[PDB]
Amino acid sequence: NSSTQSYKDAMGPLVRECMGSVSATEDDFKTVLNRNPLESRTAQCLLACALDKVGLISPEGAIYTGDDLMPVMNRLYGFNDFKTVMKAKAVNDCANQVNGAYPDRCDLIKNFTDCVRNSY
Numbered sequence: 627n628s629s630t631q632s633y634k635d636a637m638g639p640l641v642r643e644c645m646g647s648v649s650a651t652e653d654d655f656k657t658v659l660n661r662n663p664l665e666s667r668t669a670q671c672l673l674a675c676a677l678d679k680v681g682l683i684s685p686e687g688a689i690y691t692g693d694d695l696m697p698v699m700n701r702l703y704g705f706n707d708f709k710t711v712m713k714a715k716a717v718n719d720c721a722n723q724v725n726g727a728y729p730d731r732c733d734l735i736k737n738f739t740d741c742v743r744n745s746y
């Protein structure tokens with residue numbers, strides 16, 4: 627497990643809906659809910675679908691940055707935890723780092739999530 631209950635509360639319903647449009651396993655559901663490394667391509671695609679639903683992805687398939695991140699951070703985590711809120715900097719930087727670089731949508735999300743995980 628690598629996620630808070632807040633993350634699961636926000637993402638769970640979306641990931642569930644995504645199971646209907648992505649050919650992912652029940653283990654993949656757990657991987658994604660737990661914010662674990664997305665080893666399987668199915669898990670990468672499952673999160674990609676849910677992050678689109680949560681408002682993190684632009685119409686053009688880019689990960690949002692700056693102000694456009696804030697509604698997502700609020701939905702996932704609220705604003706009461708200093709460490710989590712400050713992590714928005716790493717999320718913004720990682721989004722800038724990966725955007726444009728991965729034509730495959732699931733690859734974009736694998737690399738995004740890895741970058742965020744590697745960030746202190």
Ligand SMILES: O=S(=O)(O)c1cccc2cccc(Nc3ccccc3)c12
Binds near residue numbers: 695710711714717739
């Ligand atoms: O979760 S954190 O890295 O704490 C995070 C912290 C603060 C704001 C965030 C905004 C969007 C996505 C995140 N993360 C995320 C990470 C992996 C998969 C899906 C979303 C944000």
